[PDB]
Amino acid sequence: SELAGHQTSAESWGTGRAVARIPRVRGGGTHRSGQGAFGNMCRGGRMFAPTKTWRRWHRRVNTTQKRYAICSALAASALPALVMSKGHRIEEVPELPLVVEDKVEGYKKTKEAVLLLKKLKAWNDIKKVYASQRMRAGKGKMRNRRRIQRRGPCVIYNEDNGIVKAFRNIPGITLLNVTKLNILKLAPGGHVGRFCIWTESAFRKLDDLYGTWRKAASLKSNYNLPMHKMLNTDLSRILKSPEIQRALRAPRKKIHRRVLKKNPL
């Protein structure tokens, strides 16, 4: 409150009365009279630099950089190592990316959704979300944030015909529309490699949404994939190639440690 600490008429006694010069509360007859006021060192005073509502809470991010992030999150979602390193139990999902026929877009019952995750071997990720459900340390409990859990798979669909109502009650699941992808859901915490399940219709729109290298995006007015700064990243293969190996000088892998100086005399 902009008034906190200032709803008083405190006045400094000045010097000469053997007390600090902080403004003091007026009148008498109560504990409050003659006490420090206003200053941020005082009990019941005004905090230093009171917080304002016009703090800059919101950040503009360029559209091109946002799309870059969506492209890097999807690329990192097709690599088992990155999905594994995100803690997802995908040790038995048959393939990555995991594409499932469009029938699921018409699921209605939560039991169909659970049965599909079990036959895709995506149920161990859910059981891992059930294990992580616990209470949150700290004041967040007092502020409607008592329960914490980890994220499960992300299901990406083209059209919703009950799939959202089918899956929304399974903890850890997130439903995403292929044409409205979010980096806050694809890369929770800023770390790439969320396990994603794709419907066939959603998987077929990706080229149009983000364009190939040869063909620009069709559903984005003017966009194409970000170019690679390094076409071949297999550094070990590059260094062991005969071309590079022919230009190398012989390695010097002999250690010449310090010699103890003995007096010749």
Binding site: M142, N144, R146, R168, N169
Partner: protein, 134 residues
């Protein structure tokens, strides 16, 4: 998950509306499950506990198969008093121990005109729901 914009999941608000609930709301809050036999007979799961109901304690020090009559519904303290669920004070006078209605099971229902009307409504809404899915 809750989607109603006009229902608060705020912890402070929910607790306040629990501990400041008016008497006719505390009645609904003070509801007990029916025994398995009663549930099959009436198709109802829960009833607001009432005086002269016979219940089983299923949690706490006094749990057990003994069936006693409800002798007082102290809605202010959110507890009910049951026959023989009692202890002695220092001076030896016996005192009832309060049990929350959600920790008992209703084995016999005190039935009158209104209680039968309430049971019928609950069984009817359940049937509409069961056929709605079917």
């Amino acid at each position: 998950m809750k989607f109603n914009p006009f229902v608060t999941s705020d912890r402070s608000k929910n607790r306040k509306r629990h501990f400041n609930a008016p008497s006719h709301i505390r009645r609904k809050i003070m509801s007990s499950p029916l025994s398995k036999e009663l549930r099959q007979k009436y198709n109802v799961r829960s009833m607001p506990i009432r005086k002269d109901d016979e219940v089983q304690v299923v949690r706490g020090h006094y749990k057990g198969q003994q069936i006693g009559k409800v002798v007082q519904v102290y809605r202010k303290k959110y507890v009910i008093y049951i026959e023989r669920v009692q202890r002695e004070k220092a001076n030896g006078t016996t005192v009832h121990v309060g049990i929350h209605p959600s920790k008992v099971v209703i084995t016999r229902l005190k039935l009158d005109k209104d209680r039968k009307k309430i049971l019928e409504r609950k069984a009817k809404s359940r049937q509409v729901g069961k056929e709605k899915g079917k």
